[PDB]
Each structure stands twice: as structure tokens, then as C-alpha cells.
Amino acid sequence: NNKAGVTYPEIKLGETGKDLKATITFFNGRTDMGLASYPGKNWDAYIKEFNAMYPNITVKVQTDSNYADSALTRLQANNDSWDIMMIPAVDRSEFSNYFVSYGKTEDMDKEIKLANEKAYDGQTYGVATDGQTSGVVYNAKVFKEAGINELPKTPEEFQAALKAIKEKTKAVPLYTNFAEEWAMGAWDQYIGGNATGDPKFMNQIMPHDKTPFAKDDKAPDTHPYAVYKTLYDAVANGYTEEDYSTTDWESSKGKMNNGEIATMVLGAWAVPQMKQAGEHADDVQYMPFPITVDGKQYATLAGNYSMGINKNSDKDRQEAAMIFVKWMTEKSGYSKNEGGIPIVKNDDSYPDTYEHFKDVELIVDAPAKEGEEDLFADINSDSELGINNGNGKKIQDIVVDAANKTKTIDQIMGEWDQKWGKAVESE
């Protein structure tokens, strides 16, 4: 939907669009970085640097809490109040209904990592702010006070860790952030590569499997089951916060930094935010999610939120926005301050955030089989599980079910399997 016909591979930073005078609006969920008190480089700091190269492209930022729903509402508004947003849970087959293409996916694949993540039909509609993994944020000082001198790598070792933390320390062993739906929905992030070591599990096995959530009796501490059982067991064993209904996200950052929370199950993007939330940065560390597959640990490599451009925006703003995105990708250093993997395609660097990952194999999810690019998304929709789509409510239900002992983890996963397998048959 490119009005200026300028594509991302064609943009020569500091040359292209130097004649443009426009104001563009950047809508994202980093409310922290919209504040003057951000304990790092905030948005204005980046924009000031961008303006040294493009002084006549004014970039303004808007941010919203509960971004996952606000962005969806903003797309329904169908207006010009934004030029760049972080793409929300829009299906691939709908990208071209909202966003401007950055180019052919085969061209963008020479420029960025993950060019086919936010893509459809050979066109790329999203550029990730950085590369992400999911793991566990943990306070190493708390871990030392509890006698834990090596990181758990399996679910049983993880629960034993939580038992030691609760026994020997005052830290909340694992904080759920139940009250944040996105924080609960983030458990979906662990069920593919992390849990199976198989890049083909998410997009090629799950849409052809009626029971992806059942326990794997050949390796019962692997596969999606083991992921969600970890959460179930943390709550049921009494290793989480006393009141799940009153969790608070912003204050949990400080509590992790000061050793009042021992672990939180979050992506790498969360580590600098909590390192910075207090004076004890060096106690806040990042570990692989504790699953091991045949002696090895794996982490899915997938994008953070991707930057998408409004097809409503006029010709000048579309191009200015593409120039800003390219500047964020190639120049800003944002990935390096926000716990990110750089998105420039053949940048092999990585922040110190991954210093416990030296033995971990990062694997990008395989795409769908040729011809089934929509099969997973359709199954997900029919089943209403919303896997990796923001449905945190299904995760909240586990916390409630575990805390109240109304259902076993197996009953819950069987219920998911019924809904998923019915959807699989429908499509």
C-alpha cells in the first residue's frame, strides 16, 4: 500500500527523503520510555539522535497501557492519528488491510532478521524492534541466599529451586503478574522451540495435531504440557504471591531488583527494565526457561513487537515513517539497550543479557508448509485459545484453577486439546 513507492531496501539513510518536511506519530506500548524518568535512553533521546540526520522529520510518540487492546481499537478507528505502531494481534492475511509493505520478503530478508514473521504472500509488513527470546528473570543474590549455585534446567529442578527460595529466603519465589493479561499470555511463548527443540512444532506440527497440549509420556518434562505445568505447580505448591488478583507490574520491577521477588517468567526484553529499576542491577539475571530436551536447552528466536506503517498516512508520512523504521533498525542501538537481538540481518552481536545462554540453541520457528500459511491462525481462531495472540485469560484460569484446586493440570490441558482438535478438524 506504498503511496510513495519508496521501499525499505531502497532507502539510503541520510540521502533518501532529505527533502521531506513532515511530522509523524509513533504509537507503542513502551509507556516507561515515554517518561522523562526512564532510567535509560528514552524515546526523545533516540529521536534527538534521529534528528541529527533527519532534522525536518518530526517524530512524536504516543503510548498506551494495555497496548494489545488499545492498538486493535486504534486500527478499528481507521484514521490518521498514527503513522507507526507496534503491530498488534492481527492475522497475517489481514496485514495488507492495514499496513504499508516494506518490500518483497525476499529483498527484506537480505536486510533484516525475521523478514517473514510479519509478512504475507511475499511481502513484509513489519520490522521487529529487536530479536527476542523468552526465559526467566531471577535475582542471583536471592538464589545464593537459598543455596542455589547452579541454574535449574528442568521443571523438577525449577520447583526444587522455588522450594529452597521460599524455605531459606523472604523473596516471593515466583511472581505471576496475573493482573496483567499480556504477562500471563506470555507463557505461550515457551511452548514451541523452547519446549520441544523443534523449529517445526509451532507452525507445522501443531496445526496437524489434535492434542498438542497433552503430556508427552516419552519425555514428560518437555512439550507445551510441561510449560503450563510449571505455572500450575508454582501456584499449587504455594510458591507464588499471596494474592494473585492484586499483582502490580511496575512495582514488580523494583521488587525483582531488591530481592523481594526471586523469579519472573518473562522475555529478555524485561531484564534491562528490572536491572534499571533499582540499585542492584547486577543481581538481576536471565536464565533459560528450565526445560531440557535430550540433554540440550533451546530458545525460540522471535521478534519483539514489530513496527508497522499506516496505510492511511499520506505519501510523505509513509516515507518518513519508513525512514524512521530503517533508522531504528540500522542506527539507533535500541536493541543493545533494551535486551534485544539486533535486527540488521548479519549483525551477529548480542547484549550481555545472554551470558547464561552459551550452551543454548536459539531456533527461529519454521514457517508453515507451503500452502498452509493461514492454517495455524485459523485453528487458533476457531479454538479461541489465542496461542501467542494475547489470550492471557486462559492462563489466568490456570492460576485460579491451581490456587483453588478445582482442576488438575491434565484436566485443563485436555480441555484445551478438545478445543484445539475440534478446530483442527474444522479447517
Ligand X SMILES: OC[C@H]1O[C@@H](O[C@H]2[C@H](O)[C@H](O)[C@H](O[C@H]3[C@H](O)[C@H](O)[C@H](O)O[C@@H]3CO)O[C@@H]2CO)[C@@H](O)[C@@H](O)[C@@H]1O
Q: To the nearest whole angstrom, how small is the minimum distance from the Cβ of residue 168 to ligand X? A: 30
The verdict on 113 binding ligand X (CB under 6 A) reads no
The piece of 145-153, 167-175, 266-274, 395-403 that touches ligand X (CB under 6 A) is 266-274
The answer to whether 235 and 229 are in contact (CB under 8 A) is no
Q: To the nearest whole angstrom, how small is the minimum distance from the Cβ of residue 29 to ligand X? A: 4
The verdict on 65 binding ligand X (CB under 6 A) reads yes
Among 2, 30, 334, 342, binds ligand X (CB under 6 A): 30
Q: To the nearest whole angstrom, how small is the minimum distance from the Cβ of residue 141 to ligand X? A: 22
Q: To the nearest whole angstrom, how small is the minimum distance from the Cβ of residue 395 to ligand X? A: 12
Q: To the nearest whole angstrom, how small is the minimum distance from the Cβ of residue 353 to ligand X? A: 13
The verdict on 337 binding ligand X (CB under 6 A) reads no
The four Cα atoms 53, 126, 28, 379 give a dihedral, to 10 degrees, of 180
Smaller CB separation from ligand X, 40 or 238? 40
Smaller CB separation from ligand X, 106 or 248? 248
The verdict on 175 binding ligand X (CB under 6 A) reads no
Specify which residues 272 forms β-bridges with: none
Q: To the nearest whole angstrom, how small is the minimum distance from the Cβ of residue 267 to ligand X? A: 4
Cell of 59: 517524530
Fill in the per-residue mask, 127 to 146: x = in contact with ligand X (CB under 6 A), - = not in contact: -----x--------------
Q: To the nearest whole angstrom, how small is the minimum distance from the Cβ of residue 206 to ligand X? A: 17
Q: To the nearest whole angstrom, how small is the minimum distance from the Cβ of residue 87 to ligand X? A: 9
The verdict on 31 binding ligand X (CB under 6 A) reads yes
- Please, which of residues 268-327 interact with ligand X by CB under 6 A? 269, 273, 302, 304-305
- Nearest residue to the partner ligand X, using Cβ: 32
The verdict on 67 binding ligand X (CB under 6 A) reads yes
Smaller CB separation from ligand X, 113 or 215? 113
Question: Cα(315)–Cα(319) distance, rounded to whole angstroms?
Answer: 6
Number of residues counted as binding ligand X (CB under 6 A): 17
The verdict on 251 binding ligand X (CB under 6 A) reads no
Smaller CB separation from ligand X, 267 or 342? 267
Contact residues: ligand X, CB under 6 A: 29-32, 65, 67, 132, 182, 186, 249-250, 267, 269, 273, 302, 304-305
